[PDB]
Design a protein around this ligand. Sequence first.
Ligand SMILES: *[C@H](C)[C@H]1/C(=C/c2[nH]c(/C=C3N=C(/C=C4\NC(=O)C(CC)=C4C)C(C)=C\3CCC(=O)O)c(CCC(=O)O)c2C)NC(=O)[C@@H]1C
Ligand SMILES: *[C@H](C)[C@H]1/C(=C/c2[nH]c(/C=C3N=C(/C=C4\NC(=O)C(CC)=C4C)C(C)=C\3CCC(=O)O)c(CCC(=O)O)c2C)NC(=O)[C@@H]1C
Ligand SMILES: CCC1=C(C)/C(=C/C2=NC(=C\c3[nH]c(/C=C4\NC(=O)[C@H](C)[C@H]4CC)c(C)c3CCC(=O)O)/C(CCC(=O)O)=C2C)NC1=O
Ligand SMILES: CCC1=C(C)/C(=C/C2=NC(=C\c3[nH]c(/C=C4\NC(=O)[C@H](C)[C@H]4CC)c(C)c3CCC(=O)O)/C(CCC(=O)O)=C2C)NC1=O
Ligand SMILES: CCC1=C(C)/C(=C/C2=NC(=C\c3[nH]c(/C=C4\NC(=O)[C@H](C)[C@H]4CC)c(C)c3CCC(=O)O)/C(CCC(=O)O)=C2C)NC1=O
Ligand SMILES: CCC1=C(C)/C(=C/C2=NC(=C\c3[nH]c(/C=C4\NC(=O)[C@H](C)[C@H]4CC)c(C)c3CCC(=O)O)/C(CCC(=O)O)=C2C)NC1=O
Ligand SMILES: CCC1=C(C)/C(=C/C2=NC(=C\c3[nH]c(/C=C4\NC(=O)[C@H](C)[C@H]4CC)c(C)c3CCC(=O)O)/C(CCC(=O)O)=C2C)NC1=O
Ligand SMILES: CCC1=C(C)/C(=C/C2=NC(=C\c3[nH]c(/C=C4\NC(=O)[C@H](C)[C@H]4CC)c(C)c3CCC(=O)O)/C(CCC(=O)O)=C2C)NC1=O
Lengths: 169, 40, 246, 159, 159, 48, 65, 160, 160, 160, 160, 160
Amino acid sequence: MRDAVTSLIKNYDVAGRYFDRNAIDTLKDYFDSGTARVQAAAAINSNAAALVKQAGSKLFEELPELIRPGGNAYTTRRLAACLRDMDYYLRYATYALVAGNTNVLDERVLQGLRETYNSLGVPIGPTVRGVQILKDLVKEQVAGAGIANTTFVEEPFDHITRELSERDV
Amino acid sequence: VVDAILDSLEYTETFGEDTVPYERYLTPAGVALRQLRVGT
Amino acid sequence: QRPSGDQQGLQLPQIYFSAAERRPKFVMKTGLSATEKNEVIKAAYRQIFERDITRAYSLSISDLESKVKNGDISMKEFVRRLAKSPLYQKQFYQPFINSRVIELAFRHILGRGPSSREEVQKYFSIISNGGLPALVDALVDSAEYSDYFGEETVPYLRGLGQEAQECRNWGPQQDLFNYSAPFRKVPQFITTFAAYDRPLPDQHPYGSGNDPLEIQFGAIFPKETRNPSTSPAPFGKDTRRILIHQ
Amino acid sequence: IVTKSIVNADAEARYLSPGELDRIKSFVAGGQQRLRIAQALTDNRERLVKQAGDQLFQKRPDVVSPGGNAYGQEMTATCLRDLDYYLRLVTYGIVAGDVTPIEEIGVIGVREMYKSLGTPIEAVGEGVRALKNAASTLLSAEDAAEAGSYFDYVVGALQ
Amino acid sequence: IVTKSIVNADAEARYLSPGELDRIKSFVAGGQQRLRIAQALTDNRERLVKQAGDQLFQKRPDVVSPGGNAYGQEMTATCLRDLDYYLRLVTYGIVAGDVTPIEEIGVIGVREMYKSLGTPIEAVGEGVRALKNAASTLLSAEDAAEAGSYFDYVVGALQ
Amino acid sequence: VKASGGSSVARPQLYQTLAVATITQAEQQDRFLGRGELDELASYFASG
Amino acid sequence: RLFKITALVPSLSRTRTQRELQNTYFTKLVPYENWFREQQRIQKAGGKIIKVELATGKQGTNAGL
Amino acid sequence: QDAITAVINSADVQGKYLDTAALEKLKAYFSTGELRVRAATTISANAAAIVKEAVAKSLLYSDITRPGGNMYTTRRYAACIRDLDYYLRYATYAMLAGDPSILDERVLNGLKETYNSLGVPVGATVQAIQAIKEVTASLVGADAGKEMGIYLDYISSGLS
Amino acid sequence: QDAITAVINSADVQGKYLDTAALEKLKAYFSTGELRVRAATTISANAAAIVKEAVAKSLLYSDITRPGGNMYTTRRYAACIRDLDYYLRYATYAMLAGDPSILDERVLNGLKETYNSLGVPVGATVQAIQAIKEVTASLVGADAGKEMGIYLDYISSGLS
Amino acid sequence: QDAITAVINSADVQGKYLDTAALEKLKAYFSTGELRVRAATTISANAAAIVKEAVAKSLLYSDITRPGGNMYTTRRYAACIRDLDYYLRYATYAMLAGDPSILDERVLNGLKETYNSLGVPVGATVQAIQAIKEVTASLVGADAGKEMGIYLDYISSGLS
Amino acid sequence: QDAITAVINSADVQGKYLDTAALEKLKAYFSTGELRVRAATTISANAAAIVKEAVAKSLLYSDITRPGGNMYTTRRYAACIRDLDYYLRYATYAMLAGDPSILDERVLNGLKETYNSLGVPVGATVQAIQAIKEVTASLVGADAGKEMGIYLDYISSGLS
Amino acid sequence: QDAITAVINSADVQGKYLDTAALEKLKAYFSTGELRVRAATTISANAAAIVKEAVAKSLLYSDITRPGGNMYTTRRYAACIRDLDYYLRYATYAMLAGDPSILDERVLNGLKETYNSLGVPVGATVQAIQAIKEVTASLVGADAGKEMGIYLDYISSGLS
Ligand SMILES: *[C@H](C)[C@H]1/C(=C/c2[nH]c(/C=C3N=C(/C=C4\NC(=O)C(CC)=C4C)C(C)=C\3CCC(=O)O)c(CCC(=O)O)c2C)NC(=O)[C@@H]1C
Ligand SMILES: *[C@H](C)[C@H]1/C(=C/c2[nH]c(/C=C3N=C(/C=C4\NC(=O)C(CC)=C4C)C(C)=C\3CCC(=O)O)c(CCC(=O)O)c2C)NC(=O)[C@@H]1C
Ligand SMILES: CCC1=C(C)/C(=C/C2=NC(=C\c3[nH]c(/C=C4\NC(=O)[C@H](C)[C@H]4CC)c(C)c3CCC(=O)O)/C(CCC(=O)O)=C2C)NC1=O
Ligand SMILES: CCC1=C(C)/C(=C/C2=NC(=C\c3[nH]c(/C=C4\NC(=O)[C@H](C)[C@H]4CC)c(C)c3CCC(=O)O)/C(CCC(=O)O)=C2C)NC1=O
Ligand SMILES: CCC1=C(C)/C(=C/C2=NC(=C\c3[nH]c(/C=C4\NC(=O)[C@H](C)[C@H]4CC)c(C)c3CCC(=O)O)/C(CCC(=O)O)=C2C)NC1=O
Ligand SMILES: CCC1=C(C)/C(=C/C2=NC(=C\c3[nH]c(/C=C4\NC(=O)[C@H](C)[C@H]4CC)c(C)c3CCC(=O)O)/C(CCC(=O)O)=C2C)NC1=O
Ligand SMILES: CCC1=C(C)/C(=C/C2=NC(=C\c3[nH]c(/C=C4\NC(=O)[C@H](C)[C@H]4CC)c(C)c3CCC(=O)O)/C(CCC(=O)O)=C2C)NC1=O
Ligand SMILES: CCC1=C(C)/C(=C/C2=NC(=C\c3[nH]c(/C=C4\NC(=O)[C@H](C)[C@H]4CC)c(C)c3CCC(=O)O)/C(CCC(=O)O)=C2C)NC1=O
């Protein structure tokens, strides 16, 4: 797992050279973004458990078949597993918020996701759909407590999407 | 499948109409086992 | 809550665990009746060698049973003295390469498959510097062993119902928990874990078993069935392989 | 230092505890001083390798002696290149704030490498000590303390 | 059979599943027939040992022959005492409903005992078969079936 | 994700059922069912 | 060279894992170079070490263990 | 291979002549060949109707044909119909041969490799082959539907 | 899985209550459970005699137990007895469950992979399972021997 | 793939319409396309000069072009120029697409396999791609040189 | 396996007694065991010096130990020394056994899979094993260096 | 490659001109080419007689041509004759080139993979190549039979 400061160290270590001006420029970018990132992560951490419940509510508002016979969130035994997967996606999105990379989502979430989801019969379309109910709610919560520019909050959920994506183009 | 392989343009333009076919490309593993052995 | 660096912490809900195949968990207790010790001993044999060595071949160490029945050495000591043994070396240390021996000794003792790349790096360094008894000692003494089996519980498999599972080793652990696990002979864990960080390989897009050999005659492919060597990687639809051009 | 807290809270099933968020916010605050210290050690590298080779070959003349490893111009150039590598890893550890990306590249297998190269490790430790002394002369007091931090980690690691 | 279900549900952390409670209730119902079968085998023991020795020494005369183990009055008395022991353990297994308290006393180490006594185990199996035949003649059909159950377990165990 | 591993199917039980659980207890100790593990299902199939 | 040790290791984390809650008090023999890391592991859990006793070994002997 | 060719091979690798058990096997095959041929004819009648009914039973109106599913793109729907037609056709060949070796040689050889490479869901494929088996066992009768379901369950078991 | 659990699952995935066809299936299972239990008891009686008679029928005095064969070494003979005892025991479990899913889940999962890895002959295994089926159908009667032979032929068909 | 096509795909696999964040991504791409096109034009101007300057910076007068090195034979020097022209051209394509997927699909697919098969030194290739990146960042300016160096460092990182 | 155990196995699978050719093979092994043991002793003397001289001959001062190479990181240098010590130790075991089966069973089993997974260069490994072979053939003499080079070239040929 | 081409390559990769040791190697090759050509002519005379005598020495009247052996089927006997003709022909090419690289490039490349895939016995192949070597060393004389046996033993050693 690589940080936003350690990924530069890997990129500059494979060439064997020292720090130059451009890496110092992106480090200044990360270092003035960090104070806002910590506050956004505290605001998302505070109301996370209710975010999961409202994400479940809007996810079942969207596609009715998720809570119907031929679905996967049928009983509570199969409902609690979908809700803890919502918990997992929010947790590693906050990890990627404080890290500033998408390498945490790559290395710890997305790497065996197709194998488990095809193994258990779990769908993928409603999963990324639920990921984005989560990020709309998280955008609302970050915009509530201060922080004006919310694109760094916006990116890790979309990266999780683009790798869970069944690419057809 | 045979008719579509020989119907194609990448056959007629490279080999031609009167050349016996011959091996032109190999896989990277296929050259790893070939060249890199005890007598290179 | 695992106690490590690269392993992740997970939570399985309490509902999901109840609706799963529960397994018998044989504690030692050294005082109970005459069959109820032999059941625990047969369980230690059935889990450490993946098939019971007696009733099936009828050869085993009869020296160590006489101490486990009494209570001289506990189960964490008995598993240790059973693994670094001449009997276990003939079946699991002698056929396989060290990187496959590490994963099979993870299944026999810890009851799981390797969780990270850092895990197999450290345990390969340990088996490298000290043989199989150093690996057995570093495995039996751990935090993951003693939190799970303590001193007396015979080791047991932990699939997708017993404890929460992670995505990253789900594929290889699903094939490790099998009777047909000690025939792969090709290390399924270090290969996948170090193919994760690296880009794609040069194999055929429809699996690795499609690539024939190139020796003037061909008609020869690695069987999916003869010796598994399974490594499928997701290729897109606009790929292009790289070719050497004689 | 963010990867440290992330894998630290990741082994547990809990989130990042907000004391860890406080330490990340404080590191984010100190990052500007870290970047200035790293640039000051960056632009003055050849002075530091020169004075480190000075103080080392004054301290231990056996690398200069023909029985030692660093005998001749090629071997002494490889020696100063090793000191350049360690100064580079020290600047990486100064930016990262925690010694993981420097131990991962310079510490974790160094004893068997230098053993199967023939060189003694104590002379390398004295070379990093000379680098620490020269950078202590180059920087201010609060900068030399924070540089001698990671230099001290390397000196303790090579022993 | 209650200890079987109790240690069976005890290896698990679960309680006794109510299907096991159903099998315990059914065994509790059949216990009266079990007690009558055990008393009928109890009071007629010497007939069963006599007819078992009859059918065995008619079947295998080598124990009678002086090279065999059961040669002479003392050795043949020890032989019929062994058959008495096995009939006693069969009555214990008839009462207990499951073969644990008979295997714990007569089966679990019998092969090495009879090997280091010199006696063949197949003759002991034929003796328990003769006991099963004599008890099948002594009992009714539904009683001889349920006795030949545990006698069958002993015959399979000694082989 | 760049590479992958070998998935299969996973069939976890949706609920504990009696007459799979009592088959399961004999599987985990690889014996035939005992003299009352039969006798439960004997009464169970009649009380069905 | 084996030691006879009586010890007691509470995990302090059974309530969030919902484990078997098996006994944590044992009297076991441990070999010579093994008791080192056993010592260390028992101290990792804050476990009390009641009594360390010699089972096998004469102390002060150099060759032959 | 056949059942005839398997019997001849098993008699050949011993150097054995055709004993009476092998003649029993061949005469049982020559008895069952009647309904084998009739079943193969009526399965060759309406294979497209069987595949249509099977996807309407199992795969349609799920999330699989919704966006995000593996059958969303229309080339992927056509590939799904192609794979199900393959399973039905090779099960017909294995039913008429009376030996599942052609399934092992031509279908089940490198198929899990391909389906894990492409990300094809395996359980939905198994349920689709199950729906194929139910539809053709209804269509052909029970007596030949047993032998059809044996090779379709062979494909389903080797796929898993 | 059971036949009961399969009926409950098939009623569950539709969201359907227990209709009369499912009650017919469960009542047929509750009718057949009598001979199911009696057959399982008498197969558990003399499993070793069944395996002994099966190897004496099929595998003994062949080239397989001669040197060069796969059953020449005595550990390989013991492994052969172990595999046949496994087939008989899991066929007993599938007979008492009334559903062959445990054969698919516990026996037939990766078995052809293992038998082609070790070089185990498959046709001799199929003939040994056939001899097992004939011996236990003689021993238990025809009426339960049909259901025993169904799951033993399921193992034989999935093995091939 | 594009950045446009990646945004459309990420919106498609959820079944989501184009929300405002995706419109922000597309409008940022439509803002940056100006300097993207101008950078691609001036890189297409003098690609041969860039490759010449890069080998004169990194690879020339080393031991690599001496006998024993991998660039000693003149066909190997021509193959070196070909590989560097490939890296620059595909980095130009990935810069104008704004998405590095074509590098993963067309260059970085089986390249370490080839370079370890032929015995090509990897570190010298990484330093040559680094010299390419420095030369084109000097030639195009800093503002487009950042985006050029991102994909050239992507090739360098995937190669290692 | 041994040469003794291979001779016994080849005599066993035929059911053959020990004929005179097998006794010739065993007596040739009992003749060569003298220099086998002496060679194994002096190779066990200074294995670290052999590995040091081999990396100083082949791998050092190349691009492999430079950044970008596979031996740049110090844990990768330690892993390189570990792999070369493995090759020398298992070649010593195969030399003293007189049969290369332990190389096939313990080293060459899944090694190309690992080296293509990690991106380890194969040709540099082959040249390092070649330098190992030259150093130990110089150190032990020509007469035992032939048998050492046979198993080291066996590792090199199976690796390629 | 040749011995000439190997000498030229070894002089080329150093940038060295043709020194006197290389001229000694080429003049030794030009001395030995006489008997090389004469040996190749008389081996090309009666290759079929050599293969016939070799199978009559080693492989015939064994269990290998009996049923159960790998040469029982007549297509497998023809494949055996083809493989032995290949070994003799490529050994003739390597004898006339004076360099075993064509054996490594064209025969010994993926041959153990093929022979372990098909289940071909390796030791019987080694003994057949040994009988080939004895027959052609008798037929050509000792002085060229040494060089023929060197490359045939090279094939035998690489096969094992
Ligand atoms: C309230 C007086 C009545 C009632 C109301 C109710 N239920 C829900 C939501 C759910 N109910 C379930 C139910 C089950 N899961 C199971 O496994 C079983 C065992 C057979 C049952 C009954 C589930 C999974 C949900 C959540 C998904 C859904 O909407 O169905 C609601 C909606 C609550 C909300 O808005 O979040 C309401 C109003 N159920 C009762 O018990 C009363 C009769
Ligand atoms: C909810 C949005 C969707 C859904 C979810 C669902 N998931 C499961 C089961 C599992 N999910 C996981 C997921 C992860 N494990 C990880 O380690 C990570 C990265 C940190 C992830 C994302 C795992 C391992 C399981 C298996 C259970 C376990 O944890 O051991 C289920 C249960 C399936 C069943 O039938 O039992 C469900 C229902 N399903 C939906 O419909 C939503 C689209
Ligand atoms: C190597 C030294 C060594 C010894 C001796 C040893 C003995 C030993 N004997 C035991 C039991 C026993 N030991 C005996 C032995 C005897 N009782 C008698 O009446 C006779 C006088 C005597 C036999 C000559 C018996 C009868 C038991 C059975 C108690 C039981 O298990 O219920 C037990 C209990 C558990 C078990 O057998 O498996 C141990 C540990 N362990 C050792 O490590
Ligand atoms: C960034 C991580 C990293 C480290 C640590 C590293 C060490 C390293 N030191 C080397 C050599 C060397 N290292 C030294 C070291 C010294 N001179 C002395 O006397 C002192 C003991 C010490 C330095 C003051 C010498 C003398 C050589 C040449 C030895 C030889 O040629 O055998 C070499 C082999 C030659 C080379 O490829 O450079 C490596 C790989 N390389 C790395 O990439
Ligand atoms: C309740 C559990 C239990 C068993 C099983 C048991 C067996 C037992 N059988 C014994 C002897 C014997 N057992 C037999 C047995 C036989 N005669 C034959 O020919 C047949 C093979 C077989 C019976 C039909 C004989 C002949 C002896 C005397 C052997 C001797 O004196 O060496 C002895 C030694 C003498 C004694 O102390 O009685 C024991 C302990 N004891 C037990 O407490
Ligand atoms: C529950 C389902 C199940 C099965 C069947 C199973 C089989 C199995 N059979 C094996 C070996 C074997 N299997 C056989 C069996 C046979 N070879 C023949 O010639 C006969 C045709 C056939 C016997 C009827 C033999 C001879 C071996 C020995 C190979 C060896 O160990 O060297 C092995 C290798 C390791 C070991 O036995 O302990 C496994 C895992 N595992 C399972 O979990
Ligand atoms: C007994 C047979 C056997 C071998 C050989 C073996 C090799 C092996 N080499 C490895 C790594 C490695 N192997 C090498 C070796 C090399 N790379 C190069 O550039 C050189 C050409 C070559 C050294 C001569 C390196 C550099 C790594 C480090 C990769 C990494 O860990 O990041 C790994 C990954 C994990 C680990 O080292 O601890 C294994 C398993 N395992 C075995 O059981
Ligand atoms: C130029 C180097 C080269 C070789 C050697 C080569 C061998 C080769 N031998 C084969 C088969 C075979 N190879 C053998 C040979 C043997 N089996 C035995 O029992 C004997 C020990 C040995 C003969 C001396 C046999 C019997 C087969 C038949 C297998 C089959 O086709 O069913 C096949 C499978 C397809 C085919 O023959 O047409 C190949 C490719 N190809 C090559 O390009």
